[PDB]
Symmetry: C3
Subunit: 231 residues, 3 copies
């Protein structure tokens, strides 16, 4: 484990995702509202999945070597197995908050799968220049997601209860800022141009992951928007 300088950030990430999972699990014990139960189930699964994948990276299972640039490059593939399941769950939290229609939910989840799937292909591609073709396709899929979150959901939240509109607006802004950083870290990190070393890259993804999952969840599960209007 300790033979890799980035191990400290993988261990911290593992701990923070595990602690986040347990807090949400305990906090959700005393909840019977069927609407609130939906948000607790979605939001608790997110850091639980991330916990297992951070642990796999810490123990060395989620790491492979990819030859490109005449070098064997360490690629943590477990990140994409994490994101494949956690990013659509996070979008479902937002879509259920605004009572989005089914067709829009399917478009979001499908574009998200394309985003993560093409990012994985780009991470494992051995022809250096082709890695950035996949990065560009994946980034186009992300821009579609961000467009929908702004010019489809925002207008839908305003016609909703005030507390669900204000909570959505906050979580929307958090998501757009944090998610946009991921393609940048990829491009300048060891998967892309190799400007930033792997140990610093790992620290950046850990800050982003914890903020986008545990920070996101703390804002959502403390809001009254997750409960139905009741007397």
């Amino acid at each position: 484990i300790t033979g890799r300088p980035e191990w400290i950030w993988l261990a911290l990430g593992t701990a923070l995702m595990g602690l986040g999972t347990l807090y949400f699990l305990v906090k959700g014990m005393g909840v019977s509202d069927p609407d609130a139960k939906k948000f607790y189930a979605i939001t608790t699964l997110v850091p639980a999945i991330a916990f297992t994948m951070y642990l796999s990276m810490l123990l060395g299972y989620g790491l492979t070597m990819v030859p490109f640039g005449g070098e064997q490059n360490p690629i943590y593939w477990a990140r994409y197995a994490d994101w494949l399941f956690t990013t659509p769950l996070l979008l479902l939290d937002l879509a259920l908050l605004v009572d989005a229609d089914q067709g829009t939910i399917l478009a979001l989840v499908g574009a998200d799968g394309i985003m993560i799937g093409t990012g994985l292909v780009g991470a494992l591609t051995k022809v250096y220049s082709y890695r950035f073709v996949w990065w560009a396709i994946s980034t186009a899929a992300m821009l579609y997601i961000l467009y929908v979150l702004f010019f489809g959901f925002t207008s839908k939240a305003e016609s909703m209860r005030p507390e669900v509109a204000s909570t959505f607006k906050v979580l929307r802004n958090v998501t757009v800022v944090l998610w946009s950083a991921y393609p940048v870290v990829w491009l300048i990190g060891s998967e892309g141009a190799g400007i930033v070393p792997l140990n610093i890259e790992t620290l950046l993804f850990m800050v982003l992951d914890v903020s986008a999952k545990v920070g996101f969840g703390l804002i959502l599960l403390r809001s009254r928007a997750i409960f139905g209007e009741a007397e």
Copy 2:
């Protein structure tokens, strides 16, 4: 790329799926009917997924070598990753058109997963004679799907609006004819008996894919069956 004679058909397929995706995306911009939005989302995702997998084959990522018959045989595995997601989406288009019940939808999607999954196992199997055992199981799963589309959905469409009944009947006939060709191309192509060479096999799958996805989508999204009855 150009070192493979089949590259021209992979490049054409990539272009036609990309163009198809963009047309459906633009055409769906001016749509607010929640029913129509469902069909546009399903139908636009189909060629978008196929685009990415054709590109992976063009660039050489979606290709592996499988030893059988005393030879290293080029097997494009990316086809099955495509079909795993696009064939159930196409069946969902048909099932939603006739307002099929949930139990029937699950049976269709499950049989479809078995069809594609066993076809993938057959494509990667190293014992030559066993490849055709998997082909037979996969073909049995397809025949179940075709039976349901005829002796379960057809009777359901007649009790529906006339425009949804006539549109379903057309898309049903297109699907049964085109899908039935796939097991035949597999059997006589490089995955099976090896009668037809890979470059011709690739041309045939490209014609079938574009017809079953973009041609299918053009018929559906030009129909009024996708809109609810409104004044």
Copy 3:
């Protein structure tokens, strides 16, 4: 095939899953109740999936070698591909029986995916002591599932029709007893401590699989709880 002593139990399992699939398929022909159709579709898919994965193990495709303990250990990875899809389908049978809320269904299916996913990682892990870390995480996920089936569903079934309450109680008890045996067989078998040899381990999993899928299905599909109350 016959070069492996466990082949006899893989062949028996294949036959019993295939026969089970055909019986459920025939029995479900004469069913039009939309509620009953749901249970028949879920319950017939379970042994059909298991059939294909037992066949892959029989023919040698679903087997790999994992080095640990200074030895190349035969690991049947196809079991986890089976369980990944069949265990959530079995939980869906139970959840639909008691009309569970959506949030609870998602929590069950998500915990089940974590259970199977971490068990697969543990089966393929090359550092011997780490294999049991994954076993423990997977077992914690199972205990969560069992808790929900007892202290969330049981109370919900009592407020239901008497026949659905008594049928659920029976299937609940069958599930908790049979599922609990799996982590024990893993721990003492070739994936874990290696006390029980592989051929005996394979026999035990076959008895458990057939009971948990075909036996489970025979109890459910003979009950009147799967039909709506009708005159």
